[PDB]
């Protein structure tokens, strides 16, 4: 699909680019980096809930510094249990 998927990936990127200001011409520069470091074979991109659960945990575990779980439960409005599960998740993914 890539002639078409990469084409879509490009338009989406230059939209979000100009959206954040950045000149919409650096999109192609970004599509190249994604494909260059991520490419090789095929990957299954999650759709709904699986994706949404991951985005939540990614946001949480990226704010974790090793000792701020209390701060994370307050910033994200979720329970200690939810935060610890996200953490255990960065850890498990190899
Ligand atoms: Pt790489
Ligand atoms: Pt880590």
Curated annotation (Swiss-Prot):
Taxonomic superkingdom: Viruses
Q: Family per UniProt?
A: Belongs to the c/mor transcriptional regulatory family.
Q: What does the UniProt record report as the effect of altering residue 42 to G/F/I/L/K/P/R in this chain?
A: Complete loss of DNA-binding and transcription activation ability
Task: Give me the positions annotated for DNA binding.
Answer: 68-88
Q: Which organism is it from?
A: Escherichia phage Mu (Bacteriophage Mu)
Q: Name the gene behind this protein.
A: mor
Protein name per UniProt: Middle operon regulator
Self-association and partners: Homodimer.
Q: Where found in the cell?
A: Host cytoplasm
Task: Provide the residue span(s) of the region labelled DNA-binding.
Answer: 51-94
Q: What induces it?
A: This protein is constitively expressed from the Pgem promoter unlike most other early proteins which are expressed under the control of the Pe promoter. Its expression seems to escape repression by repressor protein c and thus could occur throughout latency.
Keywords tagged on the record: Activator, DNA-binding, Early protein, Host cytoplasm, Transcription, Transcription regulation
Which parts of this chain are annotated as the region Dimerization? 2-38
Question: Keyword Nucleus: yes or no?
Answer: no
Q: What is its main location?
A: host cell
Give the classification, highest ranks. Answer: Viruses, Duplodnaviria, Heunggongvirae, Uroviricota, Caudoviricetes
Job description of the protein? Activator of the Pm promoter, which controls middle genes expression. Activation of Pm allows expression of protein C necessary for late gene expression. In addition to Mor binding, activation of Pm might require the interaction of Mor with the C-terminus of host RNAP subunits RpoA and RpoH.
């Amino acid at each position: 699909r890539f002639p078409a998927l990469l084409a879509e990936l490009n338009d989406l990127l230059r939209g979000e680019l100009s959206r954040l200001g950045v000149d919409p011409a650096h999109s192609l520069e970004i599509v190249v980096a994604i494909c260059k470091h991520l490419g090789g074979g095929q990957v299954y991109i999650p759709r709904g809930q699986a994706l949404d659960s991951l985005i939540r945990d990614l946001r949480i575990w990226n704010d974790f510094n090793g000792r701020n779980v209390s701060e994370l439960t307050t910033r994200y409005g979720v329970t200690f249990n939810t935060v610890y599960k996200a953490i255990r998740r960065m850890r498990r993914l190899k």
